[PDB]
Amino acid sequence: QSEAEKARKELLELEALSMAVESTGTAKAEAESRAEAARIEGEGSVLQAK
Amino acid sequence: LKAQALAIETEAELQRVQKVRELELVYARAQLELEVSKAQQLAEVEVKK
Secondary structure: OOHHHHOHHHHHHHHHHHHHHHHHHHHHHHHHHHHHHHHHHHHHHHHHOO | OHHHHHHHHHHHHHHHHHHHHHHHHHHHHHHHHHHHHHHHHHHHHHHHO
16 A cells, blocks of 8 residues: 555646646636626727717 | 726717806806896886886
């Protein structure tokens, strides 16, 4: 179990790189979508107010 | 961008408010000389009588 643990530390630190991706990628995606929609509304509001 | 639209509609609004109130001031002082015209002219018929 000391041998099935020196490798299991390696399986764990690779899951930490992978879980970084699933989380930073998900939050990056839902936030850049809201920033783009609000830019369209913002450039239109300048014209609409003109 | 929200500040650009706030400048556009502030410029528009003050163009109107200025153009309105300046014209209303002309009418306001024409009512005055007509008001003064009455008070002094009915005060003549009061004094002379």
